[PDB]
Amino acid sequence: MVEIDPFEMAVKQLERAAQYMDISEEALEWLKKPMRIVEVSVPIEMDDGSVKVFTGFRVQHNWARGPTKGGIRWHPAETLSTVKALATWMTWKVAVVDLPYGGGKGGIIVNPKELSEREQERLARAYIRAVYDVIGPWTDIPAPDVYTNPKIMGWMMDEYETIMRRKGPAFGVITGKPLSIGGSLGRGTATAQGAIFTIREAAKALGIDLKGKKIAVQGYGNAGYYTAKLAKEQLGMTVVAVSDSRGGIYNPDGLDPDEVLKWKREHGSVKDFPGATNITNEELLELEVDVLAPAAIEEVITEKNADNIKAKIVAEVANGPVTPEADDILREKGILQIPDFLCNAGGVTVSYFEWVQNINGYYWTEEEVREKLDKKMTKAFWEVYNTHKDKNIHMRDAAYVVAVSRVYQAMKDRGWVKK
Ligand SMILES: NC(=O)c1ccc[n+]([C@@H]2O[C@H](COP(=O)([O-])OP(=O)(O)OC[C@H]3O[C@@H](n4cnc5c(N)ncnc54)[C@H](OP(=O)(O)O)[C@@H]3O)[C@@H](O)[C@H]2O)c1
């Protein structure tokens, strides 16, 4: 259902942004192709006793800066191109906030809503058994993503530890784990906290007081719900509309995120929430708000609605929710955009913190994680902002100049590319 191919779009963005920097042709060709792709068959036993084979992908795009990092997406509409694009974005995501990581991603073409608990556990364990040879605490560190949660992360960690015979830091093979089995404090609200920090910095740059303003959030998952909650709590914002895959609810007077979450859990969706009006995702994206945070499937803003966006700041919590064309239209409209791999870099940052805690065997507190995350996100955002201001270019491009250059430097320090 995607407007354009995700990997093609990602490559187009990379070229469009490399047009504003000095990079050799060979380095560009290296960066336009994932470094390793592994397609595996994942066989599991269903509840009725039959054996079903799913398709799994583990794509690492580059590991010049360090071990690759990226979540695992469970999605019926997933394609290898989507995983390649996500790994490519992961690379820039970890480069922009200066982490010793490369870019990676994983996925399974499956509808998890049609799978039971035992089937989900079997699927996670079989995926680990399939991709064990390309993952590790120093090779490839998976994490939670769309339709995956810390539960599945703990199952995957247990399977990896069983295969690995407890020879090294198995806890560090995967992030977003439960706190009991080597989890990190603040990882649950990581991406939301990073998005909130970036929104606050953007408002500071734009000279806008966020108290009493309006935020519309698309998607009510681990990122969308926590983003709405933190915006209502920390920034003093008024959440006027939320949504999920079945539709959204809008309220001019504001919504309480906890009640909406309870209604969603007790009914399966946020639709027909009391005191709110049912709308579509297309209608929510077009609402008159001060901040719009897409936290759902990619490619939600295209030439079919780019001119209808009326938000002062668009916080791309999701991975690649805006097309380059739509980026040009929004920039022509004077709308500030927080780039996708900079806005939601808080999640990968706290995942890096969890990995450090796991490999060192020493765990931090909430305050330390909160301070380090704030420091990293503020530095990265201000670097990207000053970059886009000095060169008079789009935000997305500027972050690329901040990110790709670092990656480029790594290759020149490894001898991968001579020029
Ligand atoms: N997961 C992470 O740790 C993390 C960290 C940083 C960034 N991100 C990015 O943020 C995005 C959201 O991830 P997540 O962890 O929030 O996923 P999630 O919590 O597992 O679920 C995503 C939510 O979005 C809704 N949704 C799914 N498809 C949609 C569509 N086509 N239109 C509108 N809404 C839709 C779903 O509603 P239903 O409940 O009705 O299905 C679901 O509640 C992802 O694209 C991811 O790349 C994720």
Ligand SMILES: N[C@@H](CCC(=O)O)C(=O)O
């Ligand atoms: N934004 C990344 C971060 C995941 C991680 O912690 O590695 C994703 O979920 O795709």
